[PDB]
Ligand binder design. Structure first.
Ligand code: A3P
Ligand code: A3P
Lengths: 271, 268
Protein backbone atom coordinates (compact mmCIF):
# COMPACT_ATOMS: atom_id res chain seq x y z
CA UNK A 1 0.00 0.00 0.00
CA UNK A 2 1.42 3.38 -1.01
CA UNK A 3 1.48 6.62 0.99
CA UNK A 4 -1.55 8.21 -0.64
CA UNK A 5 -3.75 5.15 -0.21
CA UNK A 6 -2.87 4.68 3.47
CA UNK A 7 -3.40 8.42 3.84
CA UNK A 8 -6.90 8.12 2.36
CA UNK A 9 -7.89 5.37 4.79
CA UNK A 10 -6.35 7.22 7.73
CA UNK A 11 -8.25 10.39 6.82
CA UNK A 12 -11.52 9.03 5.39
CA UNK A 13 -11.68 5.45 6.69
CA UNK A 14 -13.33 4.29 9.93
CA UNK A 15 -14.02 1.10 11.89
CA UNK A 16 -17.74 0.31 11.96
CA UNK A 17 -19.67 -2.30 13.93
CA UNK A 18 -20.88 -4.92 11.40
CA UNK A 19 -24.13 -4.11 9.56
CA UNK A 20 -24.54 -7.76 8.59
CA UNK A 21 -23.48 -11.00 10.22
CA UNK A 22 -23.40 -14.57 9.00
CA UNK A 23 -24.70 -16.25 12.15
CA UNK A 24 -24.94 -19.87 11.01
CA UNK A 25 -25.13 -22.67 10.48
CA UNK A 26 -22.09 -24.84 11.29
CA UNK A 27 -20.99 -26.70 8.11
CA UNK A 28 -23.64 -24.97 6.02
CA UNK A 29 -21.10 -23.43 3.65
CA UNK A 30 -20.26 -20.29 5.61
CA UNK A 31 -16.60 -20.00 4.57
CA UNK A 32 -17.57 -20.34 0.91
CA UNK A 33 -20.21 -17.61 1.15
CA UNK A 34 -17.91 -15.17 2.93
CA UNK A 35 -15.02 -15.72 0.53
CA UNK A 36 -17.27 -15.26 -2.49
CA UNK A 37 -18.84 -12.15 -0.99
CA UNK A 38 -15.40 -10.62 -0.37
CA UNK A 39 -14.94 -10.33 -4.15
CA UNK A 40 -17.42 -7.43 -4.11
CA UNK A 41 -15.75 -4.00 -3.86
CA UNK A 42 -18.28 -2.91 -1.22
CA UNK A 43 -17.65 -5.76 1.21
CA UNK A 44 -15.03 -5.76 3.98
CA UNK A 45 -14.94 -8.58 6.50
CA UNK A 46 -13.04 -9.83 9.53
CA UNK A 47 -10.88 -12.78 8.57
CA UNK A 48 -11.30 -14.82 11.73
CA UNK A 49 -14.58 -15.75 13.40
CA UNK A 50 -14.78 -13.21 16.29
CA UNK A 51 -16.90 -15.38 18.61
CA UNK A 52 -17.86 -12.16 20.39
CA UNK A 53 -21.54 -12.74 21.09
CA UNK A 54 -20.92 -16.26 22.37
CA UNK A 55 -17.43 -16.48 23.91
CA UNK A 56 -15.90 -13.02 24.48
CA UNK A 57 -18.88 -10.77 25.13
CA UNK A 58 -17.26 -9.59 28.34
CA UNK A 59 -14.52 -7.83 26.39
CA UNK A 60 -17.07 -5.24 25.26
CA UNK A 61 -18.32 -3.70 22.01
CA UNK A 62 -15.23 -1.48 21.86
CA UNK A 63 -13.02 -4.56 21.63
CA UNK A 64 -15.37 -5.96 18.98
CA UNK A 65 -15.37 -2.76 16.92
CA UNK A 66 -11.57 -2.85 17.10
CA UNK A 67 -11.42 -6.20 15.27
CA UNK A 68 -13.29 -4.71 12.33
CA UNK A 69 -11.60 -3.66 9.10
CA UNK A 70 -11.39 0.09 8.45
CA UNK A 71 -13.95 0.89 5.74
CA UNK A 72 -14.82 3.69 3.33
CA UNK A 73 -18.33 5.08 3.00
CA UNK A 74 -20.53 2.68 1.06
CA UNK A 75 -18.72 -0.47 2.13
CA UNK A 76 -20.47 -3.00 4.36
CA UNK A 77 -18.62 -4.48 7.35
CA UNK A 78 -19.22 -8.19 8.03
CA UNK A 79 -18.13 -11.08 10.24
CA UNK A 80 -19.08 -14.75 10.44
CA UNK A 81 -19.35 -16.97 13.52
CA UNK A 82 -21.50 -20.06 12.69
CA UNK A 83 -21.95 -20.90 16.39
CA UNK A 84 -24.05 -17.75 17.02
CA UNK A 85 -27.11 -19.46 15.54
CA UNK A 86 -27.34 -21.83 18.51
CA UNK A 87 -26.05 -19.48 21.23
CA UNK A 88 -28.73 -18.66 23.82
CA UNK A 89 -27.80 -15.04 24.53
CA UNK A 90 -26.73 -14.21 20.97
CA UNK A 91 -30.03 -12.89 19.59
CA UNK A 92 -30.45 -10.51 22.54
CA UNK A 93 -26.85 -9.30 22.50
CA UNK A 94 -26.78 -8.58 18.77
CA UNK A 95 -30.10 -6.74 19.02
CA UNK A 96 -28.61 -4.73 21.91
CA UNK A 97 -25.72 -3.66 19.68
CA UNK A 98 -28.22 -2.66 16.99
CA UNK A 99 -31.80 -3.71 16.29
CA UNK A 100 -31.28 -3.10 12.56
CA UNK A 101 -28.50 -5.65 12.12
CA UNK A 102 -28.99 -7.92 9.06
CA UNK A 103 -28.54 -11.65 9.60
CA UNK A 104 -27.51 -14.31 7.07
CA UNK A 105 -27.95 -18.02 7.69
CA UNK A 106 -26.42 -20.55 5.28
CA UNK A 107 -28.55 -23.68 5.62
CA UNK A 108 -27.98 -27.21 4.39
CA UNK A 109 -29.85 -30.52 4.35
CA UNK A 110 -29.83 -31.38 8.11
CA UNK A 111 -28.73 -34.94 7.28
CA UNK A 112 -25.64 -34.02 5.26
CA UNK A 113 -24.88 -31.16 7.68
CA UNK A 114 -24.94 -33.62 10.59
CA UNK A 115 -22.61 -36.03 8.76
CA UNK A 116 -20.34 -33.14 7.79
CA UNK A 117 -20.22 -32.03 11.42
CA UNK A 118 -19.40 -35.58 12.55
CA UNK A 119 -16.70 -35.96 9.90
CA UNK A 120 -15.02 -32.80 11.18
CA UNK A 121 -15.13 -33.93 14.80
CA UNK A 122 -13.80 -37.35 13.77
CA UNK A 123 -10.78 -35.73 12.11
CA UNK A 124 -10.01 -33.98 15.40
CA UNK A 125 -10.85 -36.88 17.74
CA UNK A 126 -10.26 -40.05 15.65
CA UNK A 127 -11.24 -42.45 18.44
CA UNK A 128 -14.88 -41.43 18.90
CA UNK A 129 -17.78 -43.83 18.26
CA UNK A 130 -19.41 -44.20 14.83
CA UNK A 131 -22.00 -41.82 13.40
CA UNK A 132 -24.61 -44.56 13.68
CA UNK A 133 -23.71 -45.01 17.35
CA UNK A 134 -23.90 -41.32 18.27
CA UNK A 135 -27.14 -40.86 16.29
CA UNK A 136 -29.29 -43.06 18.51
CA UNK A 137 -30.15 -42.96 22.18
CA UNK A 138 -31.75 -46.35 21.45
CA UNK A 139 -31.06 -47.92 18.05
CA UNK A 140 -33.71 -50.63 17.80
CA UNK A 141 -36.46 -48.47 19.30
CA UNK A 142 -35.21 -45.95 16.76
CA UNK A 143 -34.97 -43.28 19.45
CA UNK A 144 -32.65 -40.53 18.22
CA UNK A 145 -30.41 -38.59 20.62
CA UNK A 146 -31.42 -34.97 20.06
CA UNK A 147 -29.04 -33.80 22.79
CA UNK A 148 -26.07 -34.57 20.51
CA UNK A 149 -24.93 -31.27 18.99
CA UNK A 150 -24.70 -32.79 15.49
CA UNK A 151 -28.43 -33.56 15.46
CA UNK A 152 -29.46 -30.51 17.49
CA UNK A 153 -27.91 -27.86 15.22
CA UNK A 154 -29.95 -29.14 12.28
CA UNK A 155 -33.35 -28.40 13.87
CA UNK A 156 -33.43 -24.99 12.19
CA UNK A 157 -37.09 -24.19 12.93
CA UNK A 158 -36.60 -24.21 16.70
CA UNK A 159 -33.46 -22.12 16.61
CA UNK A 160 -35.15 -19.69 14.23
CA UNK A 161 -37.96 -19.13 16.73
CA UNK A 162 -35.34 -17.96 19.22
CA UNK A 163 -34.06 -15.39 16.70
CA UNK A 164 -37.51 -14.20 15.65
CA UNK A 165 -38.07 -13.21 19.29
CA UNK A 166 -35.50 -10.45 18.73
CA UNK A 167 -35.48 -9.82 14.97
CA UNK A 168 -38.11 -9.44 12.24
CA UNK A 169 -38.04 -12.15 9.55
CA UNK A 170 -37.36 -9.46 6.92
CA UNK A 171 -33.91 -8.84 8.41
CA UNK A 172 -32.85 -12.43 7.86
CA UNK A 173 -31.72 -14.19 4.69
CA UNK A 174 -31.60 -17.95 4.29
CA UNK A 175 -29.00 -19.03 1.76
CA UNK A 176 -29.17 -22.48 0.15
CA UNK A 177 -25.98 -24.40 0.85
CA UNK A 178 -26.76 -26.79 -1.99
CA UNK A 179 -27.31 -24.08 -4.60
CA UNK A 180 -24.21 -22.22 -3.41
CA UNK A 181 -22.38 -25.24 -4.80
CA UNK A 182 -24.42 -25.97 -7.96
CA UNK A 183 -24.82 -22.31 -8.98
CA UNK A 184 -22.90 -19.84 -6.75
CA UNK A 185 -23.46 -16.82 -9.02
CA UNK A 186 -27.19 -17.48 -8.78
CA UNK A 187 -27.26 -17.64 -4.98
CA UNK A 188 -24.96 -14.63 -4.62
CA UNK A 189 -27.43 -12.60 -6.65
CA UNK A 190 -29.94 -12.94 -3.81
CA UNK A 191 -27.30 -12.15 -1.15
CA UNK A 192 -26.15 -8.97 -2.87
CA UNK A 193 -29.77 -7.78 -3.18
CA UNK A 194 -30.36 -8.49 0.54
CA UNK A 195 -27.29 -6.50 1.59
CA UNK A 196 -28.27 -3.63 -0.69
CA UNK A 197 -25.23 -4.20 -2.90
CA UNK A 198 -25.13 -3.89 -6.68
CA UNK A 199 -25.05 -7.30 -8.37
CA UNK A 200 -21.40 -7.42 -9.44
CA UNK A 201 -20.44 -11.01 -8.61
CA UNK A 202 -21.26 -13.16 -11.63
CA UNK A 203 -20.57 -16.42 -13.48
CA UNK A 204 -17.18 -15.20 -14.72
CA UNK A 205 -15.88 -14.94 -11.15
CA UNK A 206 -15.98 -18.71 -10.77
CA UNK A 207 -13.89 -21.57 -12.16
CA UNK A 208 -14.77 -25.23 -11.55
CA UNK A 209 -11.97 -27.36 -10.10
CA UNK A 210 -12.62 -30.88 -11.43
CA UNK A 211 -9.98 -32.32 -9.11
CA UNK A 212 -11.64 -30.87 -6.01
CA UNK A 213 -15.21 -31.15 -7.26
CA UNK A 214 -16.27 -27.69 -6.07
CA UNK A 215 -16.28 -24.33 -7.78
CA UNK A 216 -13.36 -21.99 -7.00
CA UNK A 217 -12.83 -18.25 -7.45
CA UNK A 218 -11.17 -17.32 -10.74
CA UNK A 219 -9.67 -14.38 -8.86
CA UNK A 220 -9.80 -14.08 -5.05
CA UNK A 221 -10.11 -10.91 -3.02
CA UNK A 222 -6.73 -9.31 -2.68
CA UNK A 223 -5.10 -11.75 -5.09
CA UNK A 224 -4.66 -12.03 -8.85
CA UNK A 225 -4.63 -15.82 -8.88
CA UNK A 226 -7.56 -18.23 -8.36
CA UNK A 227 -8.56 -19.60 -4.99
CA UNK A 228 -10.13 -22.91 -4.07
CA UNK A 229 -11.12 -23.57 -0.48
CA UNK A 230 -8.68 -25.76 1.45
CA UNK A 231 -8.60 -29.48 2.13
CA UNK A 232 -10.67 -28.84 5.27
CA UNK A 233 -13.54 -27.60 3.11
CA UNK A 234 -15.14 -30.44 1.19
CA UNK A 235 -14.14 -33.43 3.32
CA UNK A 236 -15.08 -36.89 2.05
CA UNK A 237 -18.00 -38.25 4.12
CA UNK A 238 -17.99 -41.82 5.42
CA UNK A 239 -20.66 -44.16 4.06
CA UNK A 240 -23.62 -44.26 6.43
CA UNK A 241 -26.04 -47.15 6.96
CA UNK A 242 -28.97 -46.66 4.56
CA UNK A 243 -31.48 -47.35 7.31
CA UNK A 244 -29.89 -44.88 9.72
CA UNK A 245 -30.09 -42.29 6.94
CA UNK A 246 -33.76 -43.01 6.28
CA UNK A 247 -34.47 -42.66 10.01
CA UNK A 248 -32.73 -39.28 10.26
CA UNK A 249 -34.43 -37.98 7.13
CA UNK A 250 -37.61 -39.12 8.84
CA UNK A 251 -36.72 -37.28 12.04
CA UNK A 252 -35.99 -33.96 10.32
CA UNK A 253 -38.85 -33.99 7.79
CA UNK A 254 -41.50 -32.33 10.00
CA UNK A 255 -39.04 -29.70 11.23
CA UNK A 256 -37.87 -29.06 7.66
CA UNK A 257 -41.44 -28.50 6.48
CA UNK A 258 -42.00 -26.01 9.30
CA UNK A 259 -38.75 -24.27 8.35
CA UNK A 260 -39.87 -24.01 4.70
CA UNK A 261 -43.05 -22.27 5.80
CA UNK A 262 -41.31 -19.95 8.26
CA UNK A 263 -38.90 -18.80 5.56
CA UNK A 264 -41.33 -18.99 2.64
CA UNK A 265 -39.04 -21.30 0.68
CA UNK A 266 -38.76 -25.02 -0.05
CA UNK A 267 -35.05 -25.86 0.10
CA UNK A 268 -35.73 -29.25 -1.47
CA UNK A 269 -34.32 -31.54 1.24
CA UNK A 270 -37.49 -33.61 1.21
CA UNK A 271 -38.10 -33.74 -2.52
CA UNK B 1 -2.08 -19.48 -1.82
CA UNK B 2 -2.94 -22.97 -0.55
CA UNK B 3 -1.96 -26.42 -1.84
CA UNK B 4 -5.11 -27.22 -3.78
CA UNK B 5 -5.15 -23.81 -5.44
CA UNK B 6 -1.45 -23.83 -6.40
CA UNK B 7 -1.84 -27.32 -7.85
CA UNK B 8 -4.71 -26.11 -10.05
CA UNK B 9 -2.52 -23.42 -11.63
CA UNK B 10 0.36 -25.81 -12.26
CA UNK B 11 -1.91 -28.36 -13.93
CA UNK B 12 -4.47 -26.21 -15.74
CA UNK B 13 -2.43 -23.01 -16.00
CA UNK B 14 -0.25 -21.97 -18.94
CA UNK B 15 1.66 -18.93 -20.19
CA UNK B 16 0.29 -17.25 -23.32
CA UNK B 17 1.42 -14.48 -25.66
CA UNK B 18 -0.60 -11.27 -25.16
CA UNK B 19 -3.88 -11.26 -27.09
CA UNK B 20 -4.28 -7.55 -26.37
CA UNK B 21 -1.69 -4.86 -25.74
CA UNK B 22 -1.89 -1.30 -24.45
CA UNK B 23 0.52 0.29 -26.94
CA UNK B 24 0.29 3.94 -25.88
CA UNK B 25 0.38 6.76 -25.48
CA UNK B 26 3.04 8.02 -23.06
CA UNK B 27 1.34 9.96 -20.24
CA UNK B 28 -2.09 9.19 -21.70
CA UNK B 29 -3.20 7.39 -18.54
CA UNK B 30 -1.91 3.88 -19.25
CA UNK B 31 -1.07 2.89 -15.66
CA UNK B 32 -4.57 3.86 -14.54
CA UNK B 33 -6.15 1.87 -17.37
CA UNK B 34 -4.22 -1.31 -16.66
CA UNK B 35 -4.69 -1.12 -12.89
CA UNK B 36 -8.44 -0.76 -13.37
CA UNK B 37 -8.63 -3.52 -15.99
CA UNK B 38 -6.77 -5.94 -13.68
CA UNK B 39 -9.78 -5.98 -11.37
CA UNK B 40 -11.56 -8.15 -13.96
CA UNK B 41 -11.41 -11.89 -13.15
CA UNK B 42 -10.65 -12.70 -16.80
CA UNK B 43 -7.65 -10.38 -17.02
CA UNK B 44 -4.05 -11.17 -16.11
CA UNK B 45 -1.31 -8.69 -16.93
CA UNK B 46 2.45 -8.51 -16.80
CA UNK B 47 3.48 -6.29 -13.90
CA UNK B 48 6.40 -4.49 -15.51
CA UNK B 49 6.47 -2.74 -18.89
CA UNK B 50 8.01 -5.35 -21.26
CA UNK B 51 9.48 -2.94 -23.81
CA UNK B 52 9.89 -6.01 -26.00
CA UNK B 53 8.71 -4.71 -29.38
CA UNK B 54 10.84 -1.58 -29.02
CA UNK B 55 13.85 -1.85 -26.68
CA UNK B 56 14.52 -5.53 -25.94
CA UNK B 57 13.46 -7.14 -29.22
CA UNK B 58 16.90 -8.68 -29.67
CA UNK B 59 16.25 -10.79 -26.58
CA UNK B 60 14.03 -13.08 -28.61
CA UNK B 61 10.43 -14.15 -28.21
CA UNK B 62 11.33 -16.77 -25.59
CA UNK B 63 12.27 -13.99 -23.15
CA UNK B 64 8.93 -12.25 -23.80
CA UNK B 65 6.61 -15.22 -23.21
CA UNK B 66 8.70 -15.90 -20.10
CA UNK B 67 7.46 -12.66 -18.54
CA UNK B 68 3.81 -13.56 -19.13
CA UNK B 69 1.59 -14.67 -16.22
CA UNK B 70 0.24 -18.22 -16.07
CA UNK B 71 -3.44 -17.95 -17.04
CA UNK B 72 -6.54 -20.16 -17.10
CA UNK B 73 -8.67 -20.84 -20.16
CA UNK B 74 -10.79 -17.79 -20.86
CA UNK B 75 -8.42 -15.33 -19.23
CA UNK B 76 -6.85 -12.68 -21.46
CA UNK B 77 -3.11 -12.05 -21.22
CA UNK B 78 -1.99 -8.41 -21.46
CA UNK B 79 0.93 -6.02 -21.14
CA UNK B 80 1.45 -2.29 -21.50
CA UNK B 81 4.38 -0.44 -23.03
CA UNK B 82 3.38 3.20 -23.80
CA UNK B 83 6.30 3.70 -26.20
CA UNK B 84 5.17 1.06 -28.73
CA UNK B 85 2.85 3.59 -30.38
CA UNK B 86 5.69 5.74 -31.67
CA UNK B 87 8.04 2.83 -32.43
CA UNK B 88 8.39 2.61 -36.21
CA UNK B 89 9.07 -1.14 -36.25
CA UNK B 90 6.41 -2.04 -33.68
CA UNK B 91 3.44 -2.43 -36.07
CA UNK B 92 5.11 -5.01 -38.33
CA UNK B 93 6.65 -6.93 -35.41
CA UNK B 94 3.44 -7.24 -33.41
CA UNK B 95 1.61 -8.33 -36.56
CA UNK B 96 4.29 -10.99 -37.04
CA UNK B 97 3.48 -12.40 -33.62
CA UNK B 98 -0.20 -12.43 -34.54
CA UNK B 99 -2.19 -10.34 -37.00
CA UNK B 100 -5.21 -10.88 -34.77
CA UNK B 101 -3.68 -8.97 -31.86
CA UNK B 102 -6.04 -6.36 -30.36
CA UNK B 103 -4.52 -2.94 -29.65
CA UNK B 104 -5.55 -0.31 -27.11
CA UNK B 105 -4.31 3.28 -27.15
CA UNK B 106 -5.10 5.67 -24.33
CA UNK B 107 -5.07 9.15 -25.84
CA UNK B 108 -4.96 12.54 -24.13
CA UNK B 109 -5.23 16.19 -25.18
CA UNK B 110 -1.87 16.55 -27.01
CA UNK B 111 -1.19 19.77 -25.14
CA UNK B 112 -1.68 18.49 -21.59
CA UNK B 113 0.09 15.26 -22.64
CA UNK B 114 3.10 17.32 -23.76
CA UNK B 115 3.20 19.30 -20.51
CA UNK B 116 2.76 16.09 -18.50
CA UNK B 117 5.66 14.54 -20.46
CA UNK B 118 7.79 17.62 -19.74
CA UNK B 119 6.84 17.55 -16.06
CA UNK B 120 8.05 13.95 -15.79
CA UNK B 121 11.35 14.80 -17.48
CA UNK B 122 11.69 17.75 -15.10
CA UNK B 123 11.25 15.46 -12.08
CA UNK B 124 14.19 13.39 -13.37
CA UNK B 125 16.38 16.40 -14.29
CA UNK B 126 15.33 19.60 -12.45
CA UNK B 127 17.85 21.71 -14.36
CA UNK B 128 16.19 21.49 -17.78
CA UNK B 129 14.91 24.68 -19.50
CA UNK B 130 11.29 25.84 -19.15
CA UNK B 131 8.56 24.14 -21.19
CA UNK B 132 8.10 27.37 -23.14
CA UNK B 133 11.79 27.42 -24.12
CA UNK B 134 11.75 23.88 -25.47
CA UNK B 135 8.47 24.34 -27.35
CA UNK B 136 9.84 26.77 -29.93
CA UNK B 137 12.58 26.26 -32.52
CA UNK B 138 12.50 29.97 -33.37
CA UNK B 139 6.69 31.30 -33.66
CA UNK B 140 8.02 28.14 -35.29
CA UNK B 141 7.28 25.19 -33.01
CA UNK B 142 10.04 22.59 -32.62
CA UNK B 143 8.07 19.63 -33.98
CA UNK B 144 11.19 17.50 -33.67
CA UNK B 145 10.87 17.62 -29.87
CA UNK B 146 9.51 14.25 -28.71
CA UNK B 147 7.04 15.89 -26.30
CA UNK B 148 5.39 17.49 -29.30
CA UNK B 149 5.84 14.74 -31.90
CA UNK B 150 4.28 12.02 -29.71
CA UNK B 151 1.06 14.06 -29.67
CA UNK B 152 0.53 13.95 -33.47
CA UNK B 153 -1.68 10.89 -33.13
CA UNK B 154 -2.93 10.81 -36.74
CA UNK B 155 0.61 10.48 -38.07
CA UNK B 156 1.46 7.52 -35.87
CA UNK B 157 -1.94 5.91 -36.50
CA UNK B 158 -1.31 5.83 -40.26
CA UNK B 159 1.71 3.57 -39.64
CA UNK B 160 -0.33 1.10 -37.60
CA UNK B 161 -3.13 0.96 -40.19
CA UNK B 162 -0.59 -0.40 -42.69
CA UNK B 163 -0.46 -3.57 -40.59
CA UNK B 164 -3.78 -3.69 -38.75
CA UNK B 165 -7.45 -3.05 -39.55
CA UNK B 166 -8.91 -0.12 -37.58
CA UNK B 167 -11.45 -2.49 -35.99
CA UNK B 168 -8.65 -4.19 -34.03
CA UNK B 169 -7.81 -0.87 -32.34
CA UNK B 170 -9.55 0.97 -29.51
CA UNK B 171 -8.85 4.58 -28.58
CA UNK B 172 -9.59 5.22 -24.94
CA UNK B 173 -10.29 8.75 -23.75
CA UNK B 174 -7.70 9.73 -21.14
CA UNK B 175 -9.88 12.60 -19.93
CA UNK B 176 -12.98 10.42 -19.54
CA UNK B 177 -10.88 7.77 -17.78
CA UNK B 178 -10.65 10.40 -15.02
CA UNK B 179 -14.16 11.86 -15.14
CA UNK B 180 -15.99 8.57 -15.78
CA UNK B 181 -13.72 5.51 -15.21
CA UNK B 182 -16.54 3.00 -15.37
CA UNK B 183 -17.72 4.52 -18.64
CA UNK B 184 -14.40 4.08 -20.43
CA UNK B 185 -13.81 0.67 -18.85
CA UNK B 186 -17.16 -0.40 -20.29
CA UNK B 187 -15.92 0.41 -23.79
CA UNK B 188 -12.73 -1.54 -23.10
CA UNK B 189 -14.42 -4.66 -21.77
CA UNK B 190 -16.74 -4.72 -24.81
CA UNK B 191 -13.76 -4.38 -27.16
CA UNK B 192 -11.89 -7.21 -25.44
CA UNK B 193 -14.95 -9.46 -25.57
CA UNK B 194 -15.01 -9.59 -21.76
CA UNK B 195 -18.24 -9.52 -19.77
CA UNK B 196 -18.97 -6.09 -18.28
CA UNK B 197 -18.01 -6.54 -14.62
CA UNK B 198 -16.04 -3.43 -13.75
CA UNK B 199 -18.59 -0.79 -12.79
CA UNK B 200 -19.09 2.50 -10.94
CA UNK B 201 -18.93 0.79 -7.52
CA UNK B 202 -15.34 -0.27 -8.20
CA UNK B 203 -14.23 3.35 -7.85
CA UNK B 204 -13.92 5.90 -5.04
CA UNK B 205 -12.96 9.51 -5.75
CA UNK B 206 -10.02 10.81 -3.70
CA UNK B 207 -10.71 14.49 -2.99
CA UNK B 208 -7.23 15.01 -1.52
CA UNK B 209 -5.40 13.58 -4.56
CA UNK B 210 -7.94 14.80 -7.11
CA UNK B 211 -8.28 11.47 -8.94
CA UNK B 212 -10.48 8.41 -8.66
CA UNK B 213 -8.99 5.42 -6.85
CA UNK B 214 -10.00 1.78 -6.90
CA UNK B 215 -12.24 0.91 -3.97
CA UNK B 216 -10.58 -2.51 -3.97
CA UNK B 217 -7.45 -3.29 -6.01
CA UNK B 218 -6.69 -6.60 -7.72
CA UNK B 219 -3.91 -7.39 -5.28
CA UNK B 220 -5.61 -6.20 -2.09
CA UNK B 221 -8.76 -6.05 0.02
CA UNK B 222 -8.02 -2.38 0.67
CA UNK B 223 -8.52 0.61 -1.66
CA UNK B 224 -5.78 1.77 -3.99
CA UNK B 225 -4.84 5.18 -5.34
CA UNK B 226 -2.07 5.58 -7.89
CA UNK B 227 1.28 6.76 -6.55
CA UNK B 228 2.69 10.25 -6.08
CA UNK B 229 4.25 9.93 -9.57
CA UNK B 230 0.82 9.59 -11.20
CA UNK B 231 -0.91 12.95 -11.13
CA UNK B 232 2.12 15.25 -10.95
CA UNK B 233 1.63 18.98 -10.47
CA UNK B 234 2.21 20.76 -13.79
CA UNK B 235 4.13 24.02 -13.99
CA UNK B 236 2.10 27.09 -14.99
CA UNK B 237 2.49 27.54 -18.76
CA UNK B 238 2.35 30.87 -20.59
CA UNK B 239 -1.12 31.35 -22.15
CA UNK B 240 0.34 32.38 -25.53
CA UNK B 241 2.38 29.20 -25.73
CA UNK B 242 -0.68 27.11 -24.84
CA UNK B 243 -2.69 28.93 -27.51
CA UNK B 244 -0.03 28.33 -30.17
CA UNK B 245 0.26 24.62 -29.36
CA UNK B 246 -3.49 24.08 -29.46
CA UNK B 247 -3.59 25.90 -32.80
CA UNK B 248 -0.78 23.63 -34.00
CA UNK B 249 -2.46 20.36 -33.06
CA UNK B 250 -6.01 21.26 -34.06
CA UNK B 251 -5.70 20.25 -37.76
CA UNK B 252 -4.12 16.95 -36.75
CA UNK B 253 -6.71 16.37 -34.02
CA UNK B 254 -9.67 16.75 -36.39
CA UNK B 255 -8.05 14.32 -38.81
CA UNK B 256 -7.51 11.89 -35.93
CA UNK B 257 -11.20 12.19 -35.00
CA UNK B 258 -12.17 11.27 -38.57
CA UNK B 259 -9.77 8.33 -38.68
CA UNK B 260 -11.04 6.91 -35.40
CA UNK B 261 -14.64 8.01 -35.78
CA UNK B 262 -14.58 9.72 -32.38
CA UNK B 263 -14.30 13.36 -31.29
CA UNK B 264 -12.29 13.40 -28.07
CA UNK B 265 -13.28 17.00 -27.43
CA UNK B 266 -9.81 18.50 -27.06
CA UNK B 267 -10.91 21.34 -29.34
CA UNK B 268 -14.58 21.41 -28.37
N1 A3P C 1 -16.75 -23.98 -3.29
C1 A3P C 1 -16.75 -24.75 -2.19
N2 A3P C 1 -15.61 -25.40 -1.87
C2 A3P C 1 -15.60 -26.18 -0.78
N3 A3P C 1 -16.58 -26.44 0.09
C3 A3P C 1 -17.70 -25.77 -0.25
C4 A3P C 1 -17.86 -24.93 -1.34
N4 A3P C 1 -19.17 -24.46 -1.41
C5 A3P C 1 -19.76 -25.03 -0.39
N5 A3P C 1 -18.94 -25.84 0.35
C6 A3P C 1 -19.34 -26.62 1.53
O1 A3P C 1 -18.97 -25.93 2.69
C7 A3P C 1 -18.95 -26.88 3.76
C8 A3P C 1 -18.26 -26.29 4.96
O2 A3P C 1 -19.09 -25.29 5.56
P1 A3P C 1 -18.50 -24.26 6.67
O3 A3P C 1 -17.50 -23.40 5.92
O4 A3P C 1 -19.71 -23.49 7.18
O5 A3P C 1 -17.87 -25.12 7.75
C9 A3P C 1 -18.32 -28.11 3.13
O6 A3P C 1 -18.85 -29.27 3.77
P2 A3P C 1 -18.16 -30.71 3.54
O7 A3P C 1 -16.73 -30.58 4.05
O8 A3P C 1 -18.98 -31.68 4.38
O9 A3P C 1 -18.26 -31.00 2.06
C10 A3P C 1 -18.77 -28.04 1.65
O10 A3P C 1 -19.79 -28.97 1.38
N1 A3P D 1 -6.90 7.64 -11.27
C1 A3P D 1 -5.79 8.27 -11.68
N2 A3P D 1 -4.84 8.60 -10.76
C2 A3P D 1 -3.75 9.24 -11.19
N3 A3P D 1 -3.41 9.63 -12.42
C3 A3P D 1 -4.36 9.28 -13.31
C4 A3P D 1 -5.54 8.61 -13.02
N4 A3P D 1 -6.32 8.47 -14.17
C5 A3P D 1 -5.61 9.05 -15.10
N5 A3P D 1 -4.42 9.57 -14.65
C6 A3P D 1 -3.45 10.30 -15.50
O1 A3P D 1 -2.46 9.40 -15.92
C7 A3P D 1 -1.31 10.19 -16.29
C8 A3P D 1 -0.10 9.29 -16.39
O2 A3P D 1 -0.22 8.46 -17.55
P1 A3P D 1 0.77 7.19 -17.76
O3 A3P D 1 0.45 6.23 -16.63
O4 A3P D 1 0.40 6.64 -19.14
O5 A3P D 1 2.19 7.71 -17.70
C9 A3P D 1 -1.26 11.28 -15.23
O6 A3P D 1 -0.62 12.43 -15.80
P2 A3P D 1 -0.20 13.68 -14.87
O7 A3P D 1 0.86 13.15 -13.92
O8 A3P D 1 0.34 14.71 -15.84
O9 A3P D 1 -1.46 14.14 -14.17
C10 A3P D 1 -2.75 11.52 -14.88
O10 A3P D 1 -3.27 12.71 -15.44
Amino acid sequence: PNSGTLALLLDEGSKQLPQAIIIGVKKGGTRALLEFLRVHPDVRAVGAEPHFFDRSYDKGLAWYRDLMPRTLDGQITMEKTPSYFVTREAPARISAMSKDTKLIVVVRDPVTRAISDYTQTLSKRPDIPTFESLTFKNRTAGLIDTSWSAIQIGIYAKHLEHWLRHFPIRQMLFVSGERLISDPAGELGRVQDFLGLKRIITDKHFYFNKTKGFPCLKKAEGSSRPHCLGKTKGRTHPEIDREVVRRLREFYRPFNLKFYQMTGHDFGWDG
